[PDB]
Design a protein around this nucleic acid. Structure first.
Ligand SMILES: [K+]
Ligand SMILES: [K+]
Ligand SMILES: [K+]
Ligand SMILES: [K+]
Ligand SMILES: [K+]
Ligand SMILES: [K+]
Ligand SMILES: [K+]
Ligand SMILES: [K+]
Ligand SMILES: [K+]
Ligand SMILES: [K+]
Ligand SMILES: [K+]
Ligand SMILES: [Mg+2]
Ligand SMILES: [Mg+2]
Ligand SMILES: [Mg+2]
Ligand SMILES: [Mg+2]
Ligand SMILES: [Mg+2]
Ligand SMILES: [Mg+2]
Ligand SMILES: [Mg+2]
Ligand SMILES: [Mg+2]
Ligand SMILES: [Mg+2]
Ligand SMILES: [Mg+2]
Ligand SMILES: [Mg+2]
Ligand SMILES: [Mg+2]
Ligand SMILES: [Mg+2]
Ligand SMILES: [Mg+2]
Ligand SMILES: [Mg+2]
Ligand SMILES: [Mg+2]
Ligand SMILES: [Mg+2]
Ligand SMILES: [Mg+2]
Ligand SMILES: [Mg+2]
Ligand SMILES: [Mg+2]
Ligand SMILES: [Mg+2]
Ligand SMILES: [Mg+2]
Ligand SMILES: [Mg+2]
Ligand SMILES: [Mg+2]
Ligand SMILES: [Mg+2]
Ligand SMILES: [Mg+2]
Ligand SMILES: [Mg+2]
Ligand SMILES: [Mg+2]
Ligand code: NA
Ligand code: NA
Ligand code: NA
Ligand code: NA
Ligand code: NA
Ligand code: NA
Ligand code: NA
Ligand code: NA
Ligand code: NA
Ligand code: NA
Ligand code: NA
Lengths: 49, 145, 68, 197, 229, 96, 128, 144
RNA sequence: UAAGCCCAAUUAGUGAUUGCCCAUUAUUCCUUUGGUAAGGGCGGAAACAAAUGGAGAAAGUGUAGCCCUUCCGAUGUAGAUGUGGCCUGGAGGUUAGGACGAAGCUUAUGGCGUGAGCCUAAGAUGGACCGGCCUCUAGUGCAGAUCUUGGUUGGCGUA
RNA sequence: UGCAAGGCCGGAAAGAAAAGAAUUAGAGGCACCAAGUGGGCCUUCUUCGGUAAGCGGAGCAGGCGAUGCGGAAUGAACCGC
RNA sequence: UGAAAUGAGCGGAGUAUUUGAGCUGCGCACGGCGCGCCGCACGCACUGGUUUCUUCUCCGUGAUGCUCCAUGUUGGCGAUGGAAAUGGGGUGCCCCCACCCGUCUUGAAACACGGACCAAGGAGUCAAACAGACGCGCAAGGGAGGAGAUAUGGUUGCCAGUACUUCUCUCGUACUGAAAGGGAGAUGCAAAAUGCAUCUGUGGUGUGCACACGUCAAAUCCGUUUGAUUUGCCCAACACC
């Protein structure tokens, strides 16, 4: 819960946090939701037939 | 033949200069710059020693034992008097010429000696003014010889 | 005035306070006293020769060290 | 609320000061406490810990034992190398059973008058522990030696004398007394001289 | 002026200060690149299992999950009225105090150790967030026999003296994935001392499936521990 | 009982969310003594001099689900003679 | 002289550790005696009983032995004792002994004023 | 000194380390060596085996002066030779003469190696002592 | 229309998975004390008078602990041990006090110590001896033994 | 030249692989010299005599005694600690 | 309250890099169906490609501080007084706690025993034998004791002390047997019912401090230090001969 200790122990934590910010973006989340469902449905149908 | 390391072991617990009063260990040692019962400050026991002492007026005297005449107690300690107005670092340099491990405490003591001299003059001047308005029944005077 | 006859209650607790110490290793206290005498007498003659050879070997080592 | 059963059994009896009243022992402990903590040598640590030990645990050594163990080292030692300094934290005593000993440098807490005479008369020299710290500040090329304790009369009386396999001496002022029952097969029984362990 | 011995120390200490800053930057760069590789391995491993479950399900098959390799065990009972066999197992598990927590391997030798002391513990299968939260918030190392909180990767590098364990992410990876240094990493740590679960327990005297607390909760241990860490 | 913390029930505060609004507010217990003693502004405002006295505290947290508060008084604990007596809960320090 | 400033003095406990039931017997002094009775309510540590001294009540070593004035008391018996406290005058205050007479006390109070040495029991008129 | 004893530590203890159950009573085992063959047999049997019984002949009016016979060994003979005389001694030459009875000894035993050759006057001698001292360049002279 | 019994929840088919209250327990913070304790510093860095930054720094078991940092433990009957731990009468040393008041005695009389206790203050008490430190020593510490001796004492202005 | 035994000289040593393939708040051993105890009692399970007993007698282990604290109004031993 | 602010947080720069989501290249893994075609939710390698959107990133201050203490703002009170504070002491009162002490006892608040008050007094001592731990002296030797000598054949006393001596006595250095009586080194050569020779020497073996040549692993401020370890000698010990 402290910024100094998180960054001292994990120098890469500034990039995991930036990745989490973009995943919670409403525009990014909605766009990914449309793409994820369409690309899994397409691959499901392709395997079925 | 008998060193300060051995002599300290012999006198650390009993000495005529050690004062344990109420749990505090002080020292009457005339050659103690501090009053603490430690090996460094026991100037009566060390081979070489130096202590800052007051002198007449604002003068400050440095009493130095250099270990040359330790077997001759009337020649063990030599007094050199610094005139009034002397810098405390000069007195601390005189002590550090023989005891470099006493330069910090000798500067602080040479300042106390000058501070006490000024306060004594102010306290004495305020006592003389008060006594001038008092009539005294007796006044003793030691006869001259 | 009857009392308790016998109990083994706190006895395992007491025996485990300072542990149940394990046995001595096999290389220690391996005395052969009381064993089969004919094999014990023969082993003595071999050990006497080994002590003679041990003394001779150290004399050769001492002489070799002084040689170099 | 921590389960720490038998954690006092883990702890051991370690003493960091000496019971000795000798002021000169306190100077050697003061000197070798400094050397033990300020040098990488393992000699100064063993010497410092033995200075703290009691008189009973600093058993004396004889001049003959030093001569014998130094000869075992003298062989298998290069001729270029010098002999080590024998170091005992204890007393060095003379042996009348060894007339001829080599020239040895021996350092000890105390030398007997005859042992000091015998070491010097053979061409050796009796050293002192502050002398050693000045020529061997780390204990390089020394022989740390200990005196014997198993021959002491206290050790030979420790233990019950009436259990099988025990050859402890009884605590008795009369040697003729306590010699009959439990000591002879004729007189009831005899304590067994051997037990398997 | 300055004494000769004081001048040699100043030059010697100046090179130590420069070399201390250099090693701090080297370990920071090493810990950054290692944590970047670890996080990518975790994410791709999650995605690979998702696709496998989809491929199995689309053809009427089932996907068998790998049996968990690591368990997180906390002691949920006090130190009173414990039998000698249960007492020794909790001592060998380093659970000598209530709410003490350890990571163990879910192998056959340890699974039969946990079954004997079930009324005293509450174990389960930890997640990445649980392992990270315990190492980062509750992580202590055994340094010279002392309990020292992990505050920088230099302590981890010195404590283990292993190239595979130099940072706190190395510790997380070894614990989470049950690496070759699982015992090295976990033994070099002090047992985790957690707070009581905020919101309370259900019944410390009954099994979890009975309506209590003292059994295996599978992955439900993570929300139990989240209230404790 | 632990006298270092007090329980205060305020009028029209009947939920735990109600009592969270008052956390950190100043709480005062007004009583009187027997003699007139020193007060704030004993010299600046001689009209304030009286046997009236006040003990001050602050709301620390709610207590239970029904709008109770825990109050910590400055330094000392509130006297037990204050039990069942009026307590003043002020609107400062203000968060609005 | 002003004393050296320290941290706040806490004084874990102010009440004395008094003897059990000493108020009911004029024989018993108030001084602490450890109860070794088998059914002692104080020894068994019941809730409503009086406490026992132990290690945990010890005072903070930084502020231990310091008087309310901020000094430590050093008993002095004549004028020459005042010279040990010239350098440590901000740490120690002199306590003239009870038996030292009024004639000798006049010289001690006079000397300590010039040396700037605090006396714990000097005359209240001087030093203002 | 009385101030160093346990009595000064046990002021206020009310039992002085003797218990509330067992107490410090007067003579709880008997007086002296009582019951060495019953009630105290284990202590006598394991710590002092041989205490009870009879063994050997009876020597009425033992006089210890007739049976005086101290012994010295071959390797200990240098204790009775002056340092300068021991330095001058050599096989085949002039040897210091040692009187045992004037030094407090009657028998020469002969364990170990003799350090300095000498002529020893002794009342008794072992066969090993007599043999070993002759091989070393010395001799034994019988005296009374 | 339980404040009873069985079951089940946690603000309720709303949108997720901690209602609340009580420990000498857990976590953490402050302080003490002791370690089978873990480490650093200790060759005074340099400079610096008063009138107008300071002080200390001991090679150390134990003190008012040589100083600082760090970690862990702390209850206990019978019992063991340790304590530069407290107290009393005498002795060998040393250093002090007293007719401007010694011991003793009194206390809403404060201070210090975790404590045994020490010290100060006041006496509208006393009237002549006695304190600290190191060592030595012993008829050396009381709450109770139907304890010993002396005095007092409610019952009681009662039978 | 085989077997047995005491050695000597070499070799190899995942220092113990992989198969769920241990863990440890794991310094092991060795002495010495001593104290209080040597009336116990209560419980979950096993258990003997007795109609039974707040009865007498045992086994493994915990507890009280020796210990309070928080809970079961109260309770040496229950529950939590 | 900045008396060393190690900060994604302070200070300097720069407007970018990268890390996730989209979308995709080849190969390999993976999944239908069979001994190579289809698929691939988008796993692994190229730390692949694009930059559509989502993020800030890059440097920096040793202690030439061994230790402790000492540096804000705004009001109220306090301008030398039978005063303003803070702590302590006293007495009462509220709300909670709270069985009578000592003692035997498995269990005492006990309807178990001793307990009206106070003062003074009151209980592990002295001697001897032995042992073990610790202190001290000397050490194959240690030490008396009794007694004498003279400083002292002197001094009220200090001085019943101190100083000095012992061909003795005692406890050890040797032990065994009921006794008569015997009485312990190593090595070499050899096998004599007392064998010869030499004597600078652990009786041998296994395990074992330090030390000495090295050799590894880790950390170094590059001087080293801290762990392990081969060999030699192994001290003290332990175990087999
Ligand atoms: K007795
Ligand atoms: K401490
Ligand atoms: K003295
Ligand atoms: K005095
Ligand atoms: K009394
Ligand atoms: K009483
Ligand atoms: K009476
Ligand atoms: K029964
Ligand atoms: K102000
Ligand atoms: K009540
Ligand atoms: K009992
Ligand atoms: Mg300087
Ligand atoms: Mg019985
Ligand atoms: Mg022997
Ligand atoms: Mg519950
Ligand atoms: Mg249960
Ligand atoms: Mg007790
Ligand atoms: Mg009682
Ligand atoms: Mg009881
Ligand atoms: Mg008085
Ligand atoms: Mg006892
Ligand atoms: Mg008894
Ligand atoms: Mg017969
Ligand atoms: Mg605790
Ligand atoms: Mg205790
Ligand atoms: Mg006193
Ligand atoms: Mg007396
Ligand atoms: Mg009163
Ligand atoms: Mg008495
Ligand atoms: Mg009575
Ligand atoms: Mg009994
Ligand atoms: Mg209750
Ligand atoms: Mg910035
Ligand atoms: Mg009874
Ligand atoms: Mg009964
Ligand atoms: Mg009772
Ligand atoms: Mg009753
Ligand atoms: Mg009775
Ligand atoms: Mg003997
Ligand atoms: Na107090
Ligand atoms: Na009283
Ligand atoms: Na010390
Ligand atoms: Na602590
Ligand atoms: Na007394
Ligand atoms: Na009593
Ligand atoms: Na009456
Ligand atoms: Na009942
Ligand atoms: Na309990
Ligand atoms: Na009150
Ligand atoms: Na003799």
């Amino acid at each position: 819960k402290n910024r100094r200790l998180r960054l001292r122990l994990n120098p890469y934590v500034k990039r995991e946090t930036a990745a989490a910010k973009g995943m919670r973006n409403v525009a990014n989340r909605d766009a990914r939701r449309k793409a994820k469902l369409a690309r899994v449905t397409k691959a499901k149908k392709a395997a079925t037939k | 033949s008998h060193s300060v390391d051995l002599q300290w072991v012999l006198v650390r617990q009993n000495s005529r200069f050690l004062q344990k009063r109420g749990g505090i260990r002080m020292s009457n040692d005339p050659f103690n710059n501090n009053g603490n019962w430690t090996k460094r400050h026991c100037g009566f026991l060390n081979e070489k020693a130096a202590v800052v002492k007051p002198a007449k007026g604002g003068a400050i005297c440095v009493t130095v034992k250099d270990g040359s005449s330790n077997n001759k107690p009337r020649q063990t300690y030599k007094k050199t008097v610094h005139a009034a107005g002397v810098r405390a670092s000069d007195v601390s340099r005189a002590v550090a010429a023989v005891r470099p491990d006493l330069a910090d405490v000798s500067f602080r003591r040479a300042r106390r000696m000058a501070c006490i001299a000024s306060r004594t003059a102010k306290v004495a001047a305020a006592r003389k003014a008060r006594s001038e308005k008092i009539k005294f029944s007796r006044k003793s005077a030691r006869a001259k010889r | 005035a009857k009392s308790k006859n016998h109990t083994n209650h706190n006895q395992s607790s007491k025996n485990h306070r300072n542990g149940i110490k394990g046995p001595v290793p096999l290389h220690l206290h391996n005395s052969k006293r009381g064993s089969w005498l004919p094999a014990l007498v023969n082993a003595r003659r071999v050990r006497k020769h080994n002590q003679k050879a041990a003394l001779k070997k150290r004399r050769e080592r001492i002489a070799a060290f002084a040689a170099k | 609320g921590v389960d720490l059963t038998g954690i006092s059994k883990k702890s051991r009896v370690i003493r960091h000061h000496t019971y000795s009243t000798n002021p000169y022992i306190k100077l050697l402990i003061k000197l070798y406490k400094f050397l033990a903590k300020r040098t990488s040598s393992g000699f100064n640590k063993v010497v410092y810990q033995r200075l703290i030990k009691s008189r009973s645990n600093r058993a004396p050594i004889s001049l003959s034992r030093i001569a014998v163990v130094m000869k075992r080292k003298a062989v298998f030692t290069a001729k270029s190398k010098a002999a080590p300094i024998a170091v005992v934290v204890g007393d060095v005593l003379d042996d009348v059973r060894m007339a001829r000993i080599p020239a040895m440098r021996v350092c000890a807490l105390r030398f007997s008058k005859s042992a000091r005479q015998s070491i010097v008369a053979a061409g050796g020299e009796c050293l002192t522990f502050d002398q050693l710290a000045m020529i061997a500040p780390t204990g390089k090329n020394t022989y740390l030696l200990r005196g014997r304790k198993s021959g002491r009369e206290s050790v030979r009386h420790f233990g019950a004398s009436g259990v099988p396999g025990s050859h402890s001496k009884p605590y008795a002022t009369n040697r003729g007394k306590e010699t009959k029952r439990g000591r002879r097969t004729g007189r009831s029984y005899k304590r067994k001289a051997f037990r398997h362990v | 002026k300055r004494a000769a011995f004081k001048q040699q120390q100043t030059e010697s200490f100046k090179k130590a200060v420069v070399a201390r800053k250099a090693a701090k930057a080297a370990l920071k760069k090493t810990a950054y690149l290692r944590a970047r590789k670890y996080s990518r391995e975790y994410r791709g491993a999650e995605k690979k299992l998702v696709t496998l479950r989809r491929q199995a399900a689309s053809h009427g098959n089932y996907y068998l999950e790998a049996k968990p390799k690591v368990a997180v065990v906390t002691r949920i009972r006090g130190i009173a009225k414990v039998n000698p066999k249960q007492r020794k197992i909790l001592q060998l598990l380093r659970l000598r105090q209530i709410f003490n927590t350890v990571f163990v391997k879910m192998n056959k030798p340890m699974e039969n150790m946990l079954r004997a002391v079930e009324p005293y513990i509450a174990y389960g299968y930890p997640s990445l967030a649980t392992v990270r939260a315990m190492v980062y918030k509750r992580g202590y190392l055994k340094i010279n026999g002392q309990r020292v909180k992990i505050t920088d990767n230099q302590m981890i590098k010195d404590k283990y003296n292993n190239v595979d364990i130099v940072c706190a992410e190395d510790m997380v990876n070894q614990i989470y994935t049950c690496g070759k240094h699982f015992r090295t990493v976990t033994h070099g740590m002090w047992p985790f001392k957690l707070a009581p679960p905020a919101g309370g327990m259900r019944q410390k005297r009954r099994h979890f499936v009975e309506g209590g607390d003292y059994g295996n909760r599978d992955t439900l241990i993570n929300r139990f521990l989240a209230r404790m860490i | 009982q632990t006298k270092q913390t007090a329980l205060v029930r305020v009028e029209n505060v009947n939920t735990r969310e109600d009592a969270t609004w008052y956390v950190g507010k100043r709480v005062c217990y007004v009583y009187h003594g027997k003699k007139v003693k020193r007060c704030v502004r004993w010299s600046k405002a001689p009209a304030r001099r009286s046997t009236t006295r006040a003990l001050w505290g602050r709301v620390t947290r709610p207590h239970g689900n029904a709008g109770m508060m825990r109050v910590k008084f400055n330094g000392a604990s509130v006297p037990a003679s204050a039990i069942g007596r009026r307590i003043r809960v002020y609107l400062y320090p203000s968060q609005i | 002289v002003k004393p050296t400033v320290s941290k706040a003095i806490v004084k874990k406990r102010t009440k004395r550790f008094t003897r059990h039931r000493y108020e009911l017997f004029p024989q018993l002094s108030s001084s602490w005696r450890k109860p070794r009775g088998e059914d002692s309510p104080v020894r068994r540590r019941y809730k409503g009983q009086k406490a026992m001294p132990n290690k945990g009540y010890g005072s903070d070593r930084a502020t231990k032995y310091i008087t309310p004035s901020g000094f430590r008391n050093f008993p002095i018996n004549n004028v020459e004792d005042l010279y040990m406290l010239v350098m440590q005058n901000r740490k120690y205050a002199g306590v003239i002994s009870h038996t030292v007479g009024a004639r000798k006390r006049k010289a001690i109070v006079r000397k300590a004023m010039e040396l700037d040495v605090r006396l714990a029991n000097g005359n209240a008129k001087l030093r203002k | 000194p009385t101030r160093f004893k346990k009595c000064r530590h046990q002021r206020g203890s009310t039992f002085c380390g003797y218990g509330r159950v067992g107490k410090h009573r007067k003579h709880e085992s008997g007086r002296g060596n009582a019951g060495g063959m019953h009630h105290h047999r284990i202590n006598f049997d394991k710590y002092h085996p041989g205490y009870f019984g009879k063994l050997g002949m009876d020597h009425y009016h033992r006089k210890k002066n007739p049976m005086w016979k101290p012994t010295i060994n071959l390797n200990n003979l240098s204790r009775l030779i002056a340092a300068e005389e021991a330095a001058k001694a050599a096989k085949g030459g002039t040897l210091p003469v040692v009187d045992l009875q004037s030094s407090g000894y009657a028998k020469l035993l002969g364990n170990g190696h003799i350090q300095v050759p000498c002529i020893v006057k002794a009342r008794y001698v072992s066969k090993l002592a007599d043999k070993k001292i002759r091989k070393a360049g010395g001799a034994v002279v019988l005296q009374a």
